[PDB]
């Protein structure tokens, strides 16, 4: 069960959060309904992915002018 636990706690949560990102607007309320059910079922694996956020913000083709 430790193999299945690290599988469900490592492979699942970035794909789950990615499906939460890329399907935030492209959804029926049926689709938002099943996504809400999925994110309710799939909560405590998202603890190692909650503070880290890397591929999130570039809605252009900009340059790092900082």
């Amino acid at each position: 069960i430790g193999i299945i636990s690290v599988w469900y706690f490592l492979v699942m949560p970035p794909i789950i959060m990615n499906w939460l990102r890329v399907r935030w607007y492209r959804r029926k309320f049926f689709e938002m309904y099943l996504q809400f059910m999925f994110v309710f079922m799939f909560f405590p694996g998202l603890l190692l992915w909650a503070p880290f956020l890397n591929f999130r913000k570039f809605p252009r083709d900009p340059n790092m002018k900082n």
Binding site: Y25, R26, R27, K57, P59
Partner: protein, 160 residues
């Protein structure tokens, strides 16, 4: 048959709850707009842009103001009609941005901008100078987190 009338009232109630549930389920489909943080036209009347050498005489900002807040000291220079203006002190805690002297200026060096991010940590910091009031705020197209704000259009559904 009073409990039958209670049942008929709840039948009409269940019909209304189902119809209003369809209405609210359709109301939950407001996906494209979603106003939030970024993470208007020229008459925003936000932060007031000021120019120092174009400000010359008539002191109309201290007169048409509803509270008379502007404090500008001036000493007349001889034979050249120069008032020697100094320290254009505007307190935005005193200021309402109600906009009288913005359009009532004879010089019209008072113009408005779109800046409103003046939430500060102290009240004595709000006493601004004439060089702080001459700063171009922001070109809001040129941010990596701000897209085009839906000014002319509405419900574009183009971000997705």
């Amino acid at each position: 048959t009073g409990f039958m009338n209670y049942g008929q009232q709840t039948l009409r109630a269940a019909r209304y709850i189902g119809q209003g549930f369809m209405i609210t389920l359709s109301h939950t489909n407001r996906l494209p707009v979603t106003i939030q943080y970024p993470y208007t036209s020229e008459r925003f009347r936000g932060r007031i842009h000021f120019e120092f050498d174009k400000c010359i005489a008539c002191e109309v900002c201290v007169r048409v103001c509803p509270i008379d807040l502007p404090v500008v000291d001036w000493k007349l220079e001889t034979n050249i009609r120069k008032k020697r203006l100094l320290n254009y002190s505007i307190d935005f805690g005193i200021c309402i941005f109600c906009g009288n002297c913005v359009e009532y200026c004879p010089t019209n060096c008072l113009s408005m901008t779109e800046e409103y991010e003046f939430s500060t940590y102290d009240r004595h910091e709000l006493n601004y100078n004439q060089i702080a009031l001459g700063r171009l705020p922001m070109s809001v197209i040129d941010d990596y987190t701000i897209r085009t704000i839906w000014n002319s259009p509405q419900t574009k559904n183009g971000v997705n």
